[PDB]
């Protein structure tokens, strides 16, 4: 795994579910360790996205302060299914 996946600015799109990792420790005190939803895009060297915390608190975060959530597809067997 090597290479720069930097397109231009925004790596994460709107509507993406993310979690706030504890690396925003100094910047968002006791607002880390939860999950949120990226609802807006910002252009700022401090904050790239506007994330709505699950508690209902809209906070501003940067790509470094967020971790994308995944639905799964790790326990599913998808190869031979013909409709429902």
Residue by residue, DSSP assigns 15-72 as T-EEEE-TT-TTTSTT--SSEEEEEEE---SS-SEEEEETTS-EEEE-GGGEEE----
User: 39, 48 in Cβ contact below 8 A?
Assistant: no
User: 66, 20 in Cβ contact below 8 A?
Assistant: yes
User: 21, 67 in Cβ contact below 8 A?
Assistant: yes
Which among 17, 13, 5 has a CA at the least distance from the CA of 67?
17
Per the rule left: phi > 0, alpha: psi between -120 and 50, beta: everything else, 72 is: left
User: 80, 43 in Cβ contact below 8 A?
Assistant: no
Residue tagged 């100094």 (tokens): 26
> By what technique were these coordinates determined?
NMR
């Amino acid at each position: 795994m090597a290479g720069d996946p930097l397109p231009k600015y925004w790596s994460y799109p709107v509507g993406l579910a993310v979690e706030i990792n504890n690396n925003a420790r100094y910047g968002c005190p006791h607002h880390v360790g939860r999950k949120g939803k990226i609802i807006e895009h910002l252009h700022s060297a401090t904050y790239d996205y506007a994330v709505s915390d699950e508690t209902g608190d809209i906070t501003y975060f940067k790509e470094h302060e967020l971790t994308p959530l995944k639905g799964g597809l790790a326990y599913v067997l998808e190869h031979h299914h013909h409709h429902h």
